[PDB]
């Protein structure tokens, strides 16, 4: 009664468990966990926030690190104030933001803190949802928390606990004797390390694994198969193409409307895909996030003639371009490919550039002139306020130029409306302003293509996430 999962990932995410977000959910709890408005309670008993201004905690009491030490408020203060201190270098740090202004964060008493936004909005609830809590006894000496040697042997608070690993190959977590919650279905987790994929395939048909994710062709392959199951789930992930606006013919809204018209999200998504296909987006926000909505959105249905017709009227002469992509993400050769055939139809030879990760993000996050194109993906979360990166004039993510002085306006109006419903008017105006723009050509909403057991149970309440893969592994069994 043990799950074994294929880990696809960093040989050495397994040395460092607090480095990887899929080990990292398994050992920690978050205190609550936030969907569409809603919250479900981890570690917290209480979430109260008041006036969009004062956010108070109170822990679960009885609550114990893997090691036996109390978790008190003096552990969820410790780990605020660890992410707000600049030295530690914390991604989550965002979160704990307000503007460019740091919350102030206090304990109330033994189980409860309570933070305060210096200014306040709605946009908060679901950020402190993704810092989990870290033990300060364990951690309060550390210059480097996510590089720090107390990593080594991890000391959670999560359903399962680390128990042995061998390099670059397996981990095992037993189920938490103790877990706050009702006790976990499955003995232990096993993350296994198969590189070869025919291996991975075999180990899947032979019952080797409960669960992978899967490629296109391995997804169609799974569905004919009588003893395992299918599904897919979102990434909460955007692939789109950037239109380089350092550029002047990219600066230009006709001939961004003109090629966006010209190309074709279902083509791209069936070459990545195959014909299982994909969610096809048209906003900036991912199905999944508050205030997402595709009403009076633009999407450039693919229209050559329209195409052609634009970029004539345009007065604007293109025959080549440059198309940038990251090797190391799904589908988006596939996308480079298809847009190259797409644009050569409207007379134009669209060039592909391979970029390997770093060197990509280093020239998207640059005012270069190198591709005319970019297809990248985003993931920013279910609250739209830090969308504006890749959308709001002056933004590190948005070098690339997009400017729209009003939807500038409309993000920072967004960010402090504390009423939900008219919160939700300012977002709506936002995805159709923008796409009337078209900055990006939107491809599709990333979807994760899992073949299991048909013995694995309780996936549904596991909550398949991105990412994490699950929510909760203690609602996971096989039969």
Same mark, same amino acid.
């Given at each position: 009664s043990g799950l074994?999962?294929?880990?696809?990932?960093?040989?050495?995410?397994? $040395?460092?468990?607090?480095?990887?977000?899929? $080990?990292? +959910?398994?050992?920690?709890?978050?205190?609550?966990? %936030?969907?569409?408005?809603?919250?479900? +309670?981890?570690?917290?008993?209480? =979430?109260?926030?008041?006036?969009?201004?004062?956010?108070?905690?109170?822990?679960?009491?009885?609550?114990?690190?893997?090691?036996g030490k109390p978790i008190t408020a003096?552990?969820?203060?410790?780990?605020?104030?660890?992410?707000?201190?600049?030295?530690?270098?914390?991604?989550?740090?965002?979160?704990?933001?307000?503007?460019?202004?740091?919350?102030? =964060?206090?304990?109330?008493?033994?189980?409860? =803190?309570?933070?305060?936004?210096?200014?306040?909005?709605?946009?908060?609830?679901?950020?402190?949802?993704?810092?989990?809590?870290?033990?300060?006894?364990?951690?309060?000496?550390?210059? +480097?928390?996510?590089?720090?040697?107390?990593?080594?042997?991890?000391?959670?608070?999560?359903?399962?606990?680390?128990?042995?690993?061998?390099?670059?190959?397996?981990?095992?977590?037993?189920?938490?004797?103790?877990?706050?919650?009702?006790e976990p279905k499955?003995?232990?987790? $096993?993350?296994?390390?198969?590189?070869?994929e025919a291996s991975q395939e075999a180990a899947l048909n032979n019952g080797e694994i409960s669960l992978?994710?899967?490629?296109?062709?391995?997804y169609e392959k799974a569905k004919?198969?009588?003893?395992?199951?299918?599904y897919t789930y979102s990434e909460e992930r955007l692939n789109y193409i950037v239109f380089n606006q350092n550029i002047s013919n990219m600066a230009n809204k006709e001939v961004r409307q003109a090629l966006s018209y010209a190309l074709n999200r279902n083509e791209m998504i069936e070459s990545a895909y195959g014909k299982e296909g994909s969610v096809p987006a048209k906003s900036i926000l991912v199905p999944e996030a508050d205030f997402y909505t595709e009403e009076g959105v633009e999407g450039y249905d693919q229209d050559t003639n329209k195409a052609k017709d634009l970029l004539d009227k345009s007065g604007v002469k293109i025959d080549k371009l440059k198309i940038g992509y990251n090797t190391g993400r799904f589908g988006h050769k596939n996308y480079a490919l298809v847009a190259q055939q797409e644009l050569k139809k409207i007379?134009?030879?669209?060039?592909?550039?391979? %970029?390997?990760?770093?060197?990509?993000?280093?020239?998207?996050?640059?005012?270069?002139?190198?591709?005319?194109? %970019?297809? +990248?993906?985003?993931?920013?979360?279910?609250?739209?306020?830090?969308?504006?990166?890749?959308f709001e004039t002056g933004q590190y993510c948005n070098q690339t130029k997009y400017s729209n002085a009003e939807i500038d306006a409309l993000w920072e109006k967004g960010f402090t409306e504390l009423n939900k419903e008219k919160r939700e008017e300012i977002y709506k105006q936002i995805?159709?302003?923008?796409?009337?723009?078209?900055?990006?050509?939107?491809?599709?909403?990333?979807?994760?293509?899992?073949a299991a057991q048909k013995n694995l149970k309780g996936i549904?309440?596991?909550?398949?996430?991105?990412?994490?893969?699950?929510?909760?592994?203690?609602?996971?069994?096989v039969e």
């Open positions: 074994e999962v294929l880990f696809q990932g960093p040989a050495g995410a397994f $040395a460092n468990v607090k480095e990887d977000s899929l $080990a990292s +959910n398994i050992v920690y709890a978050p205190l609550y966990t %936030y969907e569409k408005g809603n919250l479900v +309670n981890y570690l917290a008993e209480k =979430v109260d926030f008041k006036d969009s201004k004062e956010l108070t905690i109170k822990l679960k009491s009885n609550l114990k690190w893997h090691d003096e552990d969820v203060l410790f780990t605020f104030n660890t992410v707000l201190d600049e030295k530690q270098n914390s991604p989550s740090r965002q979160y704990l933001l307000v503007g460019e202004k740091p919350v102030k =964060v206090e304990k109330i008493d033994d189980l409860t =803190v309570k933070i305060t936004l210096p200014t306040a909005s709605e946009s908060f609830l679901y950020g402190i949802s993704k810092i989990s809590p870290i033990p300060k006894h364990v951690f309060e000496g550390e210059s +480097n928390i996510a590089k720090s040697e107390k990593n080594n042997n991890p000391v959670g608070s999560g359903a399962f606990k680390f128990k042995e690993w061998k390099k670059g190959e397996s981990i095992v977590f037993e189920k938490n004797a103790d877990y706050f919650g009702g499955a003995d232990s987790i $096993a993350l296994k390390i198969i590189p070869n992978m994710k899967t490629s296109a062709e391995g004919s198969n009588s003893n395992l199951q299918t007379g134009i030879e669209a060039e592909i550039v391979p %970029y390997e990760s770093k060197a990509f993000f280093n020239i998207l996050f640059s005012n270069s002139t190198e591709c005319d194109m %970019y297809v +990248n993906g985003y993931a920013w979360g279910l609250e739209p306020n830090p969308y504006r990166g890749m995805q159709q302003d923008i796409s009337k723009d078209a900055p990006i050509y939107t491809i599709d909403y990333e979807q994760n293509l899992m549904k309440d596991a909550k398949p996430s991105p990412a994490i893969l699950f929510e909760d592994w203690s609602k996971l069994y």
